[PDB]
Design a protein around this ligand. Sequence first.
Ligand SMILES: [Zn+2]
Ligand SMILES: [Zn+2]
Ligand SMILES: [Zn+2]
Length: 76
Amino acid sequence: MQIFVKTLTGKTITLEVEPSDTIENVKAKIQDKEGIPPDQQRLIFAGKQLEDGRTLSDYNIQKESTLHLVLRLRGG
Ligand SMILES: [Zn+2]
Ligand SMILES: [Zn+2]
Ligand SMILES: [Zn+2]
């Protein structure tokens, strides 16, 4: 299925995923796509911050949901 990701910048890249994909997997889908280390990504859905461990369905995300991307960076 498909969902979107809106970086703060306003940029909106869009991902193919599975309802039972871990967040870890998204973060991974982004690294191999924007080369941003998962361990620097943090992801938010409807104001909730999501956990490396739980799946999309856990958070009730569905086709064409927008997640916003924010970075943690304590390396610069
Ligand atoms: Zn998957
Ligand atoms: Zn990859
Ligand atoms: Zn939003």
